[PDB]
Structures are given as C-alpha cells and as structure tokens.
C-alpha cells in the first residue's frame, strides 16, 4: 500500500541536511507577516492590493464605495495626513483604516520570535553558549538580599537519593540533529505520517510564498 | 423647514441628488448646512406651487 | 531558471526542474480529460430567444389540452380547432382593450378563457417591461425584439 | 462536582488571583493546561492549543486575547487539599492591559508571568509597577522554560544564570516600585514558579523536592527546597548543601538536581526515539504505550512532561503560600478600593468578610450574552450573599450621598458564578467570591457597586476605576445611512459598557468620537461593534490624537471678567507650571483633600514654593489630578477674602470647566499655574449670581492662556521595539521616517534579540508598528504605550501659511494647522479670537 | 417658592417640543438621568453641577431644566430642581394620567378639546405625522388607536404594569412604549397635532425583528397581524390570564369543518374510494381567526359596459357569504383540492375585515381595483354564520368604525383612512390635511385596504 | 499518603470537632492539620467528660491522645 511511513529522527536529520538547498531558512511565521493567505484574502476582498500582492478584479462594481461625495466630516479640509495610509495599514487593521470593510478576513497578529540557533559545526557541543547570544552580567553580588539557608547544620540527604537522571549523557550526538528538526518546515517537522502523491508536492510553493526574491528584474516580480 | 419637517437623525443628506459625472473635489459639497438649505428651498418651492396643477 | 542560474551556474539554458510545470500540466490534463472522454464516447456511440416563446407555447398548449380533455374529441372534432380562433380573438380583444362577449360560448368556457387571458396579460406585461428595462439599461437587443418590445410598450 | 459549590462556602479556601502576561499566548497556554488538568474531558489538539481563555472569536482568529476571561476551578495541592482557584486571565497587549486594570480590583493577588527567553518586557514592567501601586501580592512565573532548554539550547549553567538574572531584574523592579519588606522573591522564598506552559511542565523547588521524595527516600521536601533553590552548592562527600562550594567542578544545587534532569529528559525525547528508549523511560519511572511512542516529537514530549511532572501542584502550593484568602486579604482591598474608609461600620464589617452581614458587591467587568442583546455584570462580592431574585440597589461609579437618584433598584436573576464550564446553575454566592450578576446591567455602565436595598442607608460605592494607560487615539463614527442611526448608537452603548478603556463622547459637532489607547484596541472595538453590537455598516474617519494646550511664558497682562450683576470683576494671570510638577501631581502624589499644612510642607520642601502661595486655595484641575493647578493668590489685604470663601466653589467649578475645555481646540490643558490675582465683588448675595462666575471664570482662563505663550502638546508614546541585532540600525531608520527619537537601546541578556526604547509622537505613531514589521520583512516587533505629553513645535495662534489639503506641513507650522483643524472638527469657531 | 422665584422659568418657554423623539442624552448618549433643557430644548444625561447638564446650563444660560423622570425644572441654575405648576402643560402632555372618570370626559369627544397650540385633539384619530416609508403601519396603528377602548387600555398604566416583563424579551418594553405614545397622542394635554413616530417606528422595528420596518413600505395586513401578535404576547404568557386582553378583544372562533376532498385528477372511482376512506370527511378546524380575511372576486379582464374602466363592485353580502360561500369552498393550492368548509362560530365584538386586494400572480403582484361597495349600517353576518348564536350576539348591528384604503400604484403607493369617534360618530378622515370629512364621498369606490367595526 | 490523613488535611480551615481519648471534645476551626493527625486550632470550645465547657484561644492536640474527629459534610462531595 505504501501509504504510511514510520521513520526515525536521524533520517529526518539527514534528509533535512540534503534538502536545505530547496528549503528556505525561515522558521517563524512572522516572516509571512502580510503574505499569509488571510492577508491576500482581505486584499482581494477590497480594491486595494499590497505592493507585494497581486491585483484583482473586484467582486462587485462597488460604486457606493468608489467615489463618495464630500460630507461634513469626510471633508479632506479637516482630515490631517501625517503619513500616507498605505495598503499595509488597511490590510493590517481592516476594521479600522477601511470605511465599510464588509466581507473581509482576519489576519494573525503576531507569533513569539523563534529564538533558535542553527548548528554550525557538528563536533562542537550542542548545549554551548553561542557567541551570537548576548552575554549576561556575571555580577559577583556579595550582598545577600536573597534568603540563605543554614551553614552545615541541616539538609541531611540520603546517599541513595541520586539527582534523578544520572549516568546518562546530558549532551549526545543526536541532540543537535533533533533540536534542529524540531524547528523544520512542515514536511520535516513530522516524525512519521502518511504519504502524498508525486504530483501534489509543490516544491516551488515555498518560494513565491516568501516576501520577494530580492534583486530580481521586473518580469520576475510580475 | 425644521418645524415643518424635523431632521433629528440628520437624514436629509441620505438621499440627496448630485452629479456623479464631475470629479469628487468639485461635484457637490454635501455639508449639513448646505443640504439643509437645499431641502428648505425645495420645500418652499413645492409649497408655493399647488400639488394639483403641477408638481416638483 | 532565475534560481538555477542564481550564482556560479551559467545564465544559459541549463536548467532542470521540470516537476514544477509537470504537475501543472498533469492537473490541467486531469481537468480536461472528462471532455475528451465524453466526446470520444459520443463518437463511439450511434447518436453522434425562446423563454418568452416557451412560456407562450406552454400556455397555449396547456389550454388546448385542457379544452380537448373537456371537449369530447371522440365525438366533435372540427369545432375544437375553431375554438383556438376564439383564443386568439380573446387575446387580441385583451390587446385592443375592447369589450369581448361571446354569448354562444358556454359560461365555464368563458371562465377558462378569462383565466387564460389574465395569465397571458400578466406574463406579457411582465416580459414587456423587463425587456424595456433590459434595452434601456444597455443590454444588446435585436431589431425584431426591439420592435416587439416597442409595440408591447 | 458539588464540591465546587461546597468549597465556595469556606471563605478561607478561596484564592482570588489575576494573571498577567508578556503576550496573551503564554498566559492562556497556562490557563488551558490548568483547565485540562482540572477537566479531563477537554484535551488540547496536537495541531493547536485549545486556548479556553479566548472566548471571543476575534481573539481566536487574530491570535491575541481580547477580553479577560475569569475562569478557573478547584485545584489540588501536594501538601494541601483542593482550593477553589478563580483566575482572571488577562490579555498580553500594552493597550489591552487596560482591561487587566479591571482585574486589579477583581482580586488582591497578581501571578505575574515572564517569558524565560524573552525576559522582562515593557508590558510586564508596567503591570508589575501597577500591581505594586495597587497593593497586591506578586508571585512570578518563569514562562516558556522550554525555550531556554530547546529553542536556545543554552548550557544548563548558563540557563540557570539567565533565570537568576531575570529573577534579580524582577526583584529590582519590584523594590524600585514598592519599599515593602515582602518584595523578596525567590524559589527559596516561594515567589517564583518555573512553568513553561508548554508540554505541561510546571514546578517549583518544593515540587521538585516532593518528586524526589516520591521517587525514593523520605527527605523532607521543605528543607530540600529551601536548600536546592539557590546557588548554595552541593557536596557529595559531605552529601549536603555546602555554601562554601567545596567541590571544584560541581554545579549549583538547582543546576545539578533540578535543571539537569529536565535537560536530560528533553535531550532524550527530542534527540531520538532510541535516546528516549524504554530503558530511559523505566529509569525515569514511566511506561508509555506504543501508541504514545508513535506520536510526533512535540506530542511525545508533551505527554512525557505532563506525566512526569504531576498536575501543576507546585503552582497551587506557591499560590496558597503567598496569595491570601479573601478573609485575610479583604482588609487591604477595603482600605484601597473603598472611598468610604475602612473605619466605617459597614466598611469594618466588609473588612471581616462576613457573609451574613450587609451585601456589598462591586461589579466592574461587563460580559455580553451569546445573543448579545443583554449583558451581565461580573464583580466580586466583598460582603453579603447575593440571591437569585433578590432586589438590590446598584449605585453607579458616579453615585454619591448628595443625590440618591444616581442609583437604581433592580432584580438579580441567575448568577452563573461558575465560569469554567460557563454554566448558570449557581443560585446564591457567598461573600468574597466573584458573581456574574444578571439583570442589573442596564442601570450601570461600568465599575458600579450593588448593595442591599434597605439593610444599609449610608453605604457608598467604591472608588472609581483608574487606569495606567490614557486613551489618546480618537476616531469618529458615522452610519452609512442615517436612517438607522439609533441602532448603531445602541451598539455604541454596548461598546461603552463592554470596554472600560473605550470612551464614547457625543461631540458638539454631531460626531460620535471613540477614544482608545492603541490602534489594535480601536480595531477590535470596531470589529466588535460591527459584528456583534451593531450589525449596521459604519463609516469612520482617519485616526486622530487628542491634543493638549500648554504654556511656556508668563502672561503679559492681567485678564479680568466682570459678572453681569453690578459689574463684579475678577482679574487673574496665568503662568506656566514649575518643571516636573505635572507628572508629580498626575501621579496622585498630592491630593487637594490633603491638609493645608502637609501640602505647604510638601511644596516648600520639594518645589520650594512660597508658604503663602501654598496656603492659597488650590484647585489642581478636575478631581485634584489635573496638571493645570489653580492657586488663589488674592492679597489678604483686600476685603474679598470673605467673598472668595463665599465664591471658592464657583471659582473651582469655573477652573475645572476651563481645564476640561480650553480656548484652543477646547481640549484638555495641562501644566498651567493659574494664579487668581484678585476679585472685586459686592458682598450682597443677590449680586453673587452662581451662573455669572463660571462663564466669567472660563473667559478669564481663555484670556490668560492667550495672554501667556500658548503651545500645542502631543502624546509621545513609549515603544519597546524588540528586534534582531542586524535590523537594529534599520529599526532606527524607521524612527527616522516617523519623526521618532531613540531613548535607549540594549541587547537582551541571554537572548540574541535586542530591545530599543523609543519615544514616537502619536501623530506619526499610527501604523508605526506596521511600518517597522514590514520594513524589517516580518522580523522586528513593536509595542507602543502612551508615555508623556510633549510640547509640539510652532505656535497654535501664530499666523502661518495654510497647509495643502493633502501634504504634510513643515515642523514650525504643525501647531497652527493642528489647532485650526481641531477647532473646526470639534464644531467650534475655527479662527482664534484674542478678544474672545 | 424657589421653584418659581427664578425669572428664568418664565424666560424658559416651550419653543420646541422634542419629547416625541426618543429620550436620550445629547452629549452622553445615555438614557439614565437624562434631564431636558427647559429653555434650550436639549436632553443631556449630566447633572446640575460638574457634568453635561451643568455645562449646558452655564452655556445656554437656561437656569431651568426639567428632570428625567419627575420633570422638575431647575429652580436654581445648579442648586435645586423644583418645577413650577404654572407651565405644567408640558408636564401633563408628557404624563398621560387620565383615569376612568377622566376617560369618561375623554370619551365625551363632543366637547371642543382644543390643544395647547389651538389644534384639534381628535381622540384616537389625531393626524399625527407618519414616516415617509411604511406609512401603512402608521395608518394601521392610528386606526387601532382610534378605538376608545384602545386608548382606555393604554391609559391604564397600572393595569399594563401589572403584567411582569421578562428580562430576556424586549417585546414588553416596546409594547409599553408604544402604548404610552398612543395614550399621549390621545390625551387632551398634547400640544402639537403632528406627533413624530420615530420612537414608535424604532420600537416596532426592534420588537418585530425588523419585520414591517419603517425603512420600506410594509403591507397593511401583515403589519396589523404582527402588531396584534405582539400585543397578545405582551399581555399573554406564563400568567394565569392566558387570554390576552388585546387577543381576547378580537379573538373570534371559526368552526371550519375542513374536508380533505380528493384531488381533481382523481377519477370517479378514486373519489368513491377516498369517500369510503373518509378522506373528504369534514374536520373542525377551530381556527382562531383574529381578523377576518375576505377576498374580492376576480378582476374584469375585459371591460364590457365602459371600455375605459369597468368596476365590478362587490356587494357587502360577499363578506356575509362566509356562512355558506366559504363553507362551500373546495379549493387549495396543493395537489389535493382541499374543501375549507369554513364556518365562523363565535364572532368577536371587534370585526377586522381585510380585503387583501393585493395578490401575487405568476409574474407580479397586482391589486384588484374593484370597489368595496360596503354600506356603513347594521350587519347580519353573525346571525347567518350561526343562527343560534344570535341570542349570544344580541348586538349584531356593527358599524364600520374605521376604513383604510390604499391608493396609487402597487409599487409607489400610499394609504388614507377615515375613522368615526365612538358615540359621537364624526366619521372624519384621519388624513392630516383632510382632518374633517364626514360624508363618504365615494369612500367605498376606492379599494378599501381594511375595515374595522365594533359590535356595539 | 493515606485517604483518611488526606481527608483530614483537606478538612483544615473549616469547623470540625474532635473527641480525644480522655473524653474532652474540642470543636473549632482546624488551622493546621499534620500528617500524624496532630491538629492545631484557634478559638476552639472544649467540653470535658464531667460537663464543664470552656473556650481556648489557641490549642494544639496530638493524635496519640485523640479518639475520633468529625468534619463537615462539604468534604463528602
């Protein structure tokens, strides 16, 4: 049947290593800020299209919202525009910066910044203070504002009470591979799942879903 | 006009008539005062002409 | 090609990523194949403006069938055809807005004629104003259709 | 499940607690873990978390919590029985934190949350400062502990040092905010709970000690927790906590015995299935089924951590240790929240939290029903027991003993006090427990106190709710067609009740203005208005910032206005307030209700003001909090001192009215030292017309402000933009475009990220976060909260060049065009008249 | 003393009477403690000191402002609010307090009840202003209010307040507001003949789930049925008095022995089989029949007498034909030709006949222009419907109290009604312009949309 | 971890009575409940076997001289 596959972590590690060429390095969904499907949905639901987003034919004529007559408060004589109200502003908050939003979609606000360090050299231990990580103040702090226990007067612990997980390597060779796979894209995040057909695996899919292939001719953009 | 026809909800400019051919900045300034005066003048004209002989 | 020739790779024709367009062509072929199969089956087998007219024909045919049910065609045959004449007469009697009274015809027959003519007049006025609205809106119409709509208006 | 209602009777088993979060995702994850532990029916899906605290669909779709969810259950404890925890999860946004302010009066204990990787944040610091000023217990929770373990993959010693640095920073912030001796927070003290909120991994030092005792031996968990919490070091040869650190290569007790096992378990699980072998599982004393092993890495880790680390007993123990019962904690809350004083007999009874005494319940939260037609007032019952059908008088936030008409009587239907299942089976609720009173929503807008009808005739409502944030972003609301204008207005009222921070004002220009704090806040307001409260489509205007009017120079000439009755004229001169006085007065440091000697001493010591000036009648704006202060410097040699005493109330009313409505844009005016020069008035009471003073007083205020140098003031918003190092300089570029000034910039300790504190003007703040996030290609993130009023460049009334209708004005011309546009939009005369 | 000592109270005059519109704050958008400006005429939710009302008093200079509930004009500019009985005309207008003894005086409409401004009170038939759209709903409400029993029931606020109002349903509050507005309109204390139905229209739209809203023109029959159902719901419910007063006033009862007669396509053998199976057996329907619905006969397709226009006037006996003609009805829109066999058993004291001239054809809805031809005199349809019921229905002489007739094209059409004061018998047109029109003036010539008569 | 000791520890903070082996019955609020049934209460009422009753501001009775204890009915659910 060849329908479901149950595999091991090192195989994902090596397959991800091989497929790094075809897979982008983006790991946090915040990179797809205004390029997720909901942003394009609410762009299509309106006349305005974001510069990175394609144009669309409006669903209806929408002559009512096309050119409204000047009103008592709608007059530009009173509206103050410090900065242009770009399409980014409208797409970000469709229910505020858009008169008569009507049928729109809701976009995800934010995702916590994925603080991950990709392994650079396999020989170096995984649980290592990477130079990119900011140093912390190793202050001596001779003061003792924090509570202190008794000095060699209590806390008689039995020798049979080990610190739980002992005689087991804290850092192993497979730790780096697994912790790197934990932040892989969708195909490699799953340890084991079901197969997909050959024709419905879009490799280029993750490419245009990115913000832009920066440094490209106009035809590539189009 | 307000005594004859009150406008508490400011619905006078709800169904106003304006020329859509002209651009937005010059077609018609639908200010509340201007709309109120237009409706008042139209009501005065309609009152000064009997509804039987003719109509506006 | 943009990516294949992104760096040290030459800017020549040496690009080999056919899967991306291969899947699209496979999907389009999958969409198309129902049409080709249907037409090939049609060949392999041996059998290789009407809305207003449809409703008018339905009205007249239904009224004629109802008359032939009521009128005993097994006995009287010719007069039934002449019945249709009164139909048309009644219709034009409605169009001219002139009085129409036929004492010779039976009263139930007159009631059936009245129902037919009221339905036909309602439909006729409806389609007349609908076609007039279509013409004035900007929809394209034919010369004969325009003349008929003008006559109805 | 009747034990849930049974435990509500025991006033000493309730733990009123409110949560806080850097981001709503972290706190809601913990709440969902608690719900799953308490309720075995609800299980979080592998794809996404349940997020039971996100009741609104807007929060579910956007991903940021919208409204606070006061939902929790009876939870067990390691060394104690089950206590009926009730937790009001709060949103994790800077503006939405205003909603959390309501929770400040719901409970007397804040279980603050701090992300391990992110560390201290602007929202967390603001919440901690507000809670310290609110006189509530603080128990910190190191959140997302797996981030340091997994995301950062930091060494265990480095992770412990980072956690200790975060705890030390929190303790320093708390000590700066409050000087109480209870500010000490540490795992040894029991004020720090390490709860990742992911994979159900929560514990304390006591929880780890109890786990050790259960695994083997009979070691006293309390002593072990007191020893292993800090860096006291462990000697294996001595086999004891040895503060001298005898072993050369040993690790600290917390690192060696607490962090190290968690790191080993995480490495075994994530590293490989063979790494987390059945042998390792047996060594850990867990036997997972084959199905659990066949799951993906994330579900397997979640199951392993949940099974290994109990059922969040450490958090319950920490809360019970420090967060007091309502009986104990009602007295400080009675002292703080109640404006009637704890010395009152009813106040004293409430301080004892007597269920059989008078009924005094304070409702401040407002929650819409499923149909949205009716509301329900959620609030704590300080004293008494509310019964279904029992009538009660709901005194509003503006209620006072002067007029009894400010309160109305209403009946209370079903209570629905229990919220975990959101059921309405509750019949009556005792004192000290949160009740969702139904049917009394109409008489009250927000923050109103219900009381028994005839039992008490002198009890008054608690003090009005106060917020740290200030609503500065104003937006106009109009219907698409006026034909159904009232319907939208109905929804507008539903907006005012639902969101305490939102302020709906009917401007004189016939425009309904909504005042909010942040752009996302007003966006959520409008979404709720259109989708739920008023289905009518609503047209809006471009967001505008409420402006202030200030002075820089003293008045050139005195300004006098004469009362119509026999020409009684008062003359005054306005001067700019002393530097630094505005924020001091606005911070409730000194109140007008203070004794004259105390205020004089304060002014002579801090600001070195004259004692005679201090002894003058002082107004200090509306509610003694307005930065624009008024001092009655009238010479005692004049015979008007008796007249001034007979006209002090009218003068104060005129001054507060002028403070609320200024001469330019009729907006709020701050930092104005209005000096009442003198007043000549006939002593006859007939000539002392009450209505002849306040208009004259505000005319004098306007003339004095015109006489002095007038300036516009915009609210500079503090923004703590966190961004990766590479984009940091580019981030400044964004502030370059939006007229922003960088105040500080520091790297995140223990994290590659980098925080930048900047002061962005509100005029350019609209969409600043969007510009920062898009320009940085979705990497940088920002969060802006109003910080302080700053004087805008230019002169409001100076004759300047009229700006183009669609072109930004030059910096010197901003003030005049701001003033003219605000005056015209408000509906008042655009041109500023010196004579007027 | 101080309530009238202030000269501002004399200076405060009723320049504009905006109490017809909904009572809400002009600056706070709140209905709680909304004091109205006695001189300026604007209602704000603020108080007399340090609030919106204080600002209004210090700006408009109106030292007097009526209270939200007690309607107490501010005796002092800010100190105290005590009204003066000298200008109590507005207080009486806003507070309908006509008891049964005073209702008898109100029932004595023969007296010239000149309003405050000198207009005609017209109890129940006041030419109040109507919305531009859905004016048929306003006409139906006025015709319902034209009954002195309706005004008496509305004025019985204590009786109205006796029924408990469930918090969940807003129907009771809307019904109470509409009844209060109707009582104020019928009260002699009113000042302006034209009354704004904006509050009434909003209440009707909100209560009826936007059905028959004032935004668009609504059918008179549907609006009347919805209003009757809402009134029945307001008075009926969980209380022991299940029979609502509004419902029981115009309930009625038809003992329609409905027969499921066989379909026309069924032959004689199938008809005999169905009869043996008791298919065409008459079954009593016991229909409520709150308002009788009498349908006009077929329109004249071809004009015979006068080709320009033929008006087939329907005799009033057609309505009275429901005793046997409706009992002989053997017609249905379903496949089976249902035999209605309608038989009205108990005739309600109030007879509300709906012509239902509008009817949907296969393409468009058209109205029969046939004349009503209904004389205004005694009737005997109740005796015809049930001969034995004549003893129970002693007062069979019912006169058409109020008749409303549509006018104009079905798309852009309006309505006009004529109502007669009970006892007085003025029979005047309720139109604002044509207040006094006693003679029929070919009233039955137009297609009367609906008629309302009292058994008397 | 016993079921009866856990029920006695969970019953702390409520009104309960305890009859000792000497006949003295002390009823009051259980302030602290130990693992060995040592109960420390505050503001309790103690009635001896002779019938004399008294009030104690704070007491602590060990489980060795305690016979039985009766808690409230809220712990049954």
Author numbering:
A (entry chain A): 224 to 445
B (entry chain A): 1113 to 1168
C (entry chain A): 613 to 660, 675 to 779
D (entry chain C): 116 to 951
E (entry chain U): 100 to 555
F (entry chain 53): 3 to 79
What does the original paper state about this entry?
Here cryo-electron microscopy analyses of human CE pre-B complex and B-like complexes reveal extensive structural similarities with their CI counterparts. The results indicate that the CE and CI spliceosome assembly pathways converge already at the pre-B stage. Add-back experiments using purified CE pre-B complexes, coupled with cryo-electron microscopy, elucidate the order of the extensive remodelling events that accompany the formation of B complexes and B-like complexes. The molecular triggers and roles of B-specific proteins in these rearrangements are also identified.
To that end, we determined cryo-EM structures of complexes formed after the addition of an excess of 5′ss oligo to affinity-purified CE pre-B dimers in the absence or presence of ATP or ATPγS. ATPγS was previously shown to support the formation of human B complexes but prevents their subsequent transformation into activated B (Bact) complexes and/or their dissociation. The cryo-EM structures of the protomers of affinity-purified CE pre-B dimers incubated with 5′ss oligo (designated pre-B5′ss) or with 5′ss oligo plus ATPγS (designated pre-B5′ss+ATPγS) were determined at 4.2 Å and 3.1 Å, resolution, respectively, at their tri-snRNP cores. Owing to the absence of the B-specific protein SNU23, which stabilizes the binding of a second 5′ss oligo in B-like complexes, only one 5′ss oligo is bound in pre-B5′ss in a manner similar to the 5′ss oligo 1 in B-like complexes. Thus, an extended U6/5′ss helix does not form. As a consequence, U4/U6 stem III, the formation of which is mutually exclusive of that of an extended U6/5′ss helix, is still present, as well as the U4 quasi-pseudo knot and its associated proteins RBM42 and SNRNP27K. In pre-B5′ss complexes, 5′ss oligo binding triggers the movement of the PRP8 RT/En domain (PRP8RT/En) towards the PRP8 N-terminal domain (PRP8NTD). This action generates a half-closed PRP8 conformation that is also found in B-like and B complexes. However, no large-scale translocation of BBR2 or substantial repositioning of other tri-snRNP components like those in CE pre-B is observed. However, PRP4 kinase (PRP4K) and the SF3B3 WD40B domain (SF3B3WD40B) are located farther apart in pre-B5′ss complexes compared with pre-B complexes, and PRP4K interacts more extensively with PRP6HAT, which may potentially contribute to activation of its kinase activity.
